[PDB]
Amino acid sequence: MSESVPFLKKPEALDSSMAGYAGFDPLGLSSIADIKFLQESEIKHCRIAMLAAAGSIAQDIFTFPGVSKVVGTAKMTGVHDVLVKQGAMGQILLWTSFLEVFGTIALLETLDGKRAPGDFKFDPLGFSKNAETAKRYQLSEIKNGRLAMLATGGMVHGYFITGKGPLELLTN
Amino acid sequence: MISDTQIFIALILALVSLVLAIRLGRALYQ
Amino acid sequence: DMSASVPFLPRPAALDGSMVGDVGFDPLGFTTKYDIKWLRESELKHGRVCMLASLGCIVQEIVHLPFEATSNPVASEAFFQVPAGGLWQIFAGIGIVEHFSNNFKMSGSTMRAPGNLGFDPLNFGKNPSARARYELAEIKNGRLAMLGFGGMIHGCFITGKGPIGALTSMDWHQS
Amino acid sequence: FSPVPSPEGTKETYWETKAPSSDVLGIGAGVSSGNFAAASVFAALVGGYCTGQVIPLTVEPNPLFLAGSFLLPYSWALHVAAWIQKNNGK
Amino acid sequence: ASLDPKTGFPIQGGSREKLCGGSASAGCQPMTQAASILDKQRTVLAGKITVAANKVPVLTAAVDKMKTAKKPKLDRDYVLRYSALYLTTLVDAMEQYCLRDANGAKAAGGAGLPKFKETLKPASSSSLYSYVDTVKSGIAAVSAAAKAGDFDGVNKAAGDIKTAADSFLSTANPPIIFN
Amino acid sequence: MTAAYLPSILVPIIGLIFPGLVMAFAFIYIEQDE
Ligand code: CLA
Ligand code: CLA
Ligand SMILES: CC1=C(C#C/C(C)=C/C=C/C(C)=C/C=C/C=C(C)/C=C/C=C(\C)C#CC2=C(C)C[C@@H](O)CC2(C)C)C(C)(C)C[C@H](O)C1
Ligand SMILES: CC1=C(C#C/C(C)=C/C=C/C(C)=C/C=C/C=C(C)/C=C/C=C(\C)C#CC2=C(C)C[C@@H](O)CC2(C)C)C(C)(C)C[C@H](O)C1
Numbered sequence A: 001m002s003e004s005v006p007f008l009k010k011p012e013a014l015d016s017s018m019a020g021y022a023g024f025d026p027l028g029l030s031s032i033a034d035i036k037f038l039q040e041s042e043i044k045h046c047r048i049a050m051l052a053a054a055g056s057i058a059q060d061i062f063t064f065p066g067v068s069k070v071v072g073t074a075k076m077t078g079v080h081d082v083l084v085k086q087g088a089m090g091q092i093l094l095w096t097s098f099l100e101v102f103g104t105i106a107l108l109e110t111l112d113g114k115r116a117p118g119d120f121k122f123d124p125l126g127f128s129k130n131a132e133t134a135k136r137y138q139l140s141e142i143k144n145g146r147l148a149m150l151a152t153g154g155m156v157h158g159y160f161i162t163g164k165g166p167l168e169l170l171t172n
Numbered sequence B: 001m002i003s004d005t006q007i008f009i010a011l012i013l014a015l016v017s018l019v020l021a022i023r024l025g026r027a028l029y030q
Numbered sequence C: 001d002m003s004a005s006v007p008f009l010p011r012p013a014a015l016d017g018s019m020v021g022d023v024g025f026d027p028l029g030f031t032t033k034y035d036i037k038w039l040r041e042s043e044l045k046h047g048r049v050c051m052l053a054s055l056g057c058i059v060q061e062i063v064h065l066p067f068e069a070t071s072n073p074v075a076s077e078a079f080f081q082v083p084a085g086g087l088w089q090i091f092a093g094i095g096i097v098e099h100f101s102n103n104f105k106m107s108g109s110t111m112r113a114p115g116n117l118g119f120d121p122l123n124f125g126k127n128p129s130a131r132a133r134y135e136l137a138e139i140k141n142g143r144l145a146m147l148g149f150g151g152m153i154h155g156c157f158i159t160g161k162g163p164i165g166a167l168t169s170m171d172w173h174q175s
Numbered sequence D: 001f002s003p004v005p006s007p008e009g010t011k012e013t014y015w016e017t018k019a020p021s022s023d024v025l026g027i028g029a030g031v032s033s034g035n036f037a038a039a040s041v042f043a044a045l046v047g048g049y050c051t052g053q054v055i056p057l058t059v060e061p062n063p064l065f066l067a068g069s070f071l072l073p074y075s076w077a078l079h080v081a082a083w084i085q086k087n088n089g090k
Numbered sequence E: 001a002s003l004d005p006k007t008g009f010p011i012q013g014g015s016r017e018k019l020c021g022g023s024a025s026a027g028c029q030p031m032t033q034a035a036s037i038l039d040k041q042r043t044v045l046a047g048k049i050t051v052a053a054n055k056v057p058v059l060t061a062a063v064d065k066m067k068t069a070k071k072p073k074l075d076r077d078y079v080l081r082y083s084a085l086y087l088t089t090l091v092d093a094m095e096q097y098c099l100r101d102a103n104g105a106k107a108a109g110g111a112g113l114p115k116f117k118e119t120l121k122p123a124s125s126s127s128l129y130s131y132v133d134t135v136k137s138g139i140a141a142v143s144a145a146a147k148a149g150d151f152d153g154v155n156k157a158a159g160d161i162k163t164a165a166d167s168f169l170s171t172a173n174p175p176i177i178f179n
Numbered sequence F: 001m002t003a004a005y006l007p008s009i010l011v012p013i014i015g016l017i018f019p020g021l022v023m024a025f026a027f028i029y030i031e032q033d034e
Helices: A035-061 A078-085 A088-112 A133-162 A166-171 B004-029 C036-062 C075-080 C084-101 C128-159 C163-168 D022-028 D033-052 D063-069 D071-086 E037-068 E076-103 E129-148 E151-172 F006-030
Strands: none
Touching (some): C036 C128, D022 D071, D033 D063, D063 D071, E037 E151, E076 E151
């Protein structure tokens, strides 16, 4: 039986060893798609959403030199439009597309099984050299990433109603 | 209008096609 | 096993470590589809052209022949304000040099170390290990000059000035 | 006359039973017959609703109602998959 | 030495077959050529101008036939379709010669592919841009006469184009390049 | 017509010499033992 949803049966493709396992798959989506594909996809959505949430908050707090005269009022997604007329969004697109071409290759060996989901071996600083601290950081990455996906949705949707942007919407 | 030099360009390129057609035909013939 | 430069990727089979310039950097598997001797010959020839071209860009912007049709210091615009009979004469001469150096060979026919065209008239490669060091130097400066020349020609399309002119006066106070 | 190639993962799908084996469903081989049947009705209702909302088509149609209208034929394949899974005991 | 009236291709040999080493002598033979790519683009543009201008009396002769007829109608479609095809081609080619004549080598592709943000001097600041203005006004006259039904108006306006285009060629003296 | 001399050169060659040569050489090829 399932941990998160007691009435529902345990998801067949989901196991405790996998990070952020709460036995949560009511719709049985893990049965449809390859689990490694979903796991890499969750991790990718998590990391982009963490960047997006921190980006929302920091763009509230301060702005980089000169951006105020490129874009004056727009805060959350309005800036995206101003900067596509300029070249900023295109530049970031090009370099993330470069990284995602190598991510295309990386996902191919993940489906071959020789690479773990989300494992890009990018640990320059010494933060994973325990294999106990590594598993805790793995869990915290998944949980903070899930929280960031929901938060990014809440911050942009709040902008969609109000236009205030996150922390300004908090103040007024 | 078309100049005669332009006609001569076409005759050069069609000649190149004639030479390539012979070589393809000889390859098909073995 | 794994790729030295790309840690999450496996190391390509056709690299093997021995061949100069290898940090395991072949993610798109181009060595499985093509012979690596031809690829290195192409890389060396590309880098050699690019080192000549980048040096040409800087030096043309500083100095030019005491003639009209050579005055323009923007490399791209210099290509057009100059006798085209001379330009084709260079193109024909390059065709000659390419033939003799490669000993009149095609892709299979060329393969002889890849890129060792024999045009080293002076005895710089005295020590063979110093030769190996110079080989690593040659590819690293060639790879750097491929990106470097590309930046210079696209700066010249953007700025319209040339390499050193585009650097010295880059418009900090606008896009 | 020479071996005819098929993509890797080609399996045998010829059936003479009441229903085909669940392998004919591809990535949906493990979905239950209840889940297709509920998806089948859901796709039919949402697809019909989205189709109904744009029957007088304009030069500005709502793109979600267009995309949502593709659920109606997709529901046909869903109830066929629901019948196949029910008759395979899934 | 000049441009063929109908083809717009370098016609006369120029009596220059010099192999002459040392001084190139602008030897019309390739690899002895002293002409820039810019000069060759200019001769192509001048050839386009010749084709258009020689075509100008065709409209003039056609319009005269129209006026002579038992009942005269001034085919607005013919006059407009001439203007849309031949006349506009003249103006754009004249503008391009001015662009090369003013900014210089940058218009030859020195600044790159044609872009929405051309980073060069415009077709203005040219001594022969005034002739381009004459043709532009004449195109407006040709269309205005066709809408009005004025046979004489079309003929005079086409004549204005012919004088202006010939004037452009004479002041420019486009280099005749055969390579 | 531009290069108006070309039809009076190429049509007799294409229409008479070209078939006259392919018939002559095809006949030799179809009537040889080796
Ligand atoms: C399939 C293409 C095709 C066909 C059917 C024709 C038909 C004709 N052409 Mg030709 N022509 C063509 C392509 C073609 N043209 C092309 C591409 C060129 C540019 C090089 C020319 C250049 C050309 C000239 C310069 C002249 C003609 C002329 C003619 C006419 C008389 C025949 C003659 O003299 O041929 C001569 C044609 C050539 C020497 C050109 C080569 C023909 C093409 C390229 C080869 C086609 C091969 C074909 C696919 C396979 C045939 C074999 C068959 C048994 C399977 C006739 C209307 C003459 C004319 O107008 O008389 C009034 C004339 O003077 N044509
Ligand atoms: C396919 C193209 C073709 C062409 C270009 C011609 C051309 C001609 N035909 Mg026609 N003819 C053709 C097909 C063609 N024929 C076919 C298919 C048939 C059969 C239906 C005929 C039947 C036919 C008849 C019955 C007659 C002609 C005549 C003529 C000649 C026109 C009148 C004239 O002034 O002649 C003046 C002719 C000359 C001054 C003699 C010139 C002889 C040439 C130049 C020498 C040829 C040498 C030879 C072909 C080399 C052979 C090489 C080897 C590979 C076979 C002219 C040469 C008439 C004719 O012969 O005129 C006398 C004529 O009576 N034709
Ligand atoms: C050092 C280094 C590493 C690294 C790294 C990096 C850069 C790591 C960065 C990680 C990041 C960016 C984490 C940020 C998470 C944000 C969250 C969870 C959001 C919470 C918001 C909530 C609940 C909300 C809300 C809100 C709503 C919706 C609307 C608002 O009106 C109001 C409000 C604001 C309250 C790595 C691992 C790469 C390797 C190596 O070791 C080197
Ligand atoms: C082998 C050997 C011999 C030899 C030899 C020879 C011919 C040696 C010649 C070697 C050469 C020409 C090396 C030149 C390399 C150029 C480089 C590395 C630059 C890259 C560009 C950069 C960093 C940039 C940039 C720029 C950008 C993009 C935008 C700009 O606005 C500004 C900026 C400047 C910053 C010989 C044959 C004589 C015989 C002998 O027996 C053996």
